[PDB]
């Protein structure tokens, strides 16, 4: 999975993320870049333009929760399946979310990290984060 | 015996576009794999025969291969990854116009909640604006063959609109290859187009061979109205192009009666 | 197909990229190779080490092709016909790879031009690169 070197570059970067902001910015961008996803979030209210989306407080708040789940995944790279089993079941059975979108959100997250960190978001740190997004996506798809 | 799925497709949100196959609503759907590992669709139409397209059948073959060359190079599954063995393939005799083949299995499948044929219609359900459901194993928004089944809910579109989109004009001497994806569908009086202008989940590579299914609410039965032919639109071009099942019905019935 | 508004977003964002296009191309390939090692198998003849001059050269050609697509957004299939045959028929590049390189270009732009990488511009570019990727794969067989 992650060399210990990669684990290290990852948690090093994560420790600097604005926990209150990057989750809302990733979710916010998912909804603007892949607009078909908005149908899942009618209880968030106004998503009708990119500013509406990016300034919506429910997007920001739900974003925090998504980021928090990625924080959980970081703590448990060895058991992403168990860690995400309940969430996988919710997204599948209750929400009917196509599992392709887990990878899209992941990737949008990577884009946001690159956006905030610039040059520190080097190719090798990207590569390690790509392992993490894939691992989180597979685990979220696992109960499908 | 056909067209009565245990768990018929029933999306929570009636929004034209993509949906997850949450309930397992397409037991007629099969998965074909070519000798160079490309996933495509086929559609179970009775206990022993499937429809698919001629282009699907030709993947990784010379444009001179025969049904006998093709048949032993295919792999086919139904239900929960159940390999079924093929006895033969029958190409439509005018497959450059009607993009179709039939597949005969060496034995009948046993029907259950995950494996069941769709009915072939005698009625022409392809009125412009008719809402159907197209399931498929094609590539998704990451260009990966989907791990889980998904469908698109879509209307039949105006034939002239679709012709102008891909060919610029209905008039033969004014036609030019205008396809937004750089390959041209087979379009004629034997086909219909489906879709709407929307940035969406669309059908894409590998979805061909799958059915445009219509639910006849009076009979409460599901029918294959089209077989998807042009699976290359992928939300860049605006329409999928489907072979009209009513236009091949007689050929299908004769073929099955003969083999 | 891209809306007028998308095309305007793409033309402006890529006009700002300007002479950086090569470097950004090269970095996107470098990210792709390291994040998704299977992509390296299409380039067994390359020096793929960090800072390889052969990669910078190729990044420049990739950039020029995208510039040409951007210049001819209403006629992309035609402008890319030679490339589309190259990728789909001769090289047989699996479609998945185009989404990998597309993502890595986006990452590279975000890291280099954060002021230009707004949500709307991100959406328009993703759509543009998904149109390029589709044109380059529709002939894949
Ligand atoms: C890696 C990707 C994702 C993660 C970590 C994630 C995580 C979560 C979390 C932690 C919650 C709150 C669950 C709870 O309260 O028990 C949630 C809810 C939800 N997620 Fe996701 N999710 C992901 C992807 C997606 C995607 C792609 C969609 C839709 C396109 C989606 C739609 C939802 C919806 C609709 C809810 C319910 C929210 C509400 O009721 O207010 N998720 N997700
Ligand atoms: C936006 C996507 C892409 C664009 C615009 C692009 C463009 C090009 C261009 C301009 C060439 C050079 C053609 C020449 O010198 O005549 C080329 C060659 C090539 N491309 Fe791509 N390409 C893209 C994606 C990919 C991807 C995803 C792969 C593989 C993972 C790939 C693999 C190749 C290879 C192997 C060559 C041949 C290299 C050589 O000449 O030795 N391309 N591409
Ligand atoms: C296959 O096509 C055969 C020939 O097509 C017919 O004759 C040619 C010259 C054209 O005039 C064409 O438009 C006509 O359709 C048909 O005679 C034959 O019925 C077709 N077979 C099936 C099974 O559909
Ligand atoms: C919804 As329409 C016929 O303009 O594609």
Numbering used by the authors:
A (entry chain B): 3 to 146
B (entry chain C): 148 to 406
C (entry chain A): 2 to 142
The authors write:
haptoglobin forms a stable complex with a haemoglobin dimer. Trypanosomes take up this HpHb complex but not the individual components.
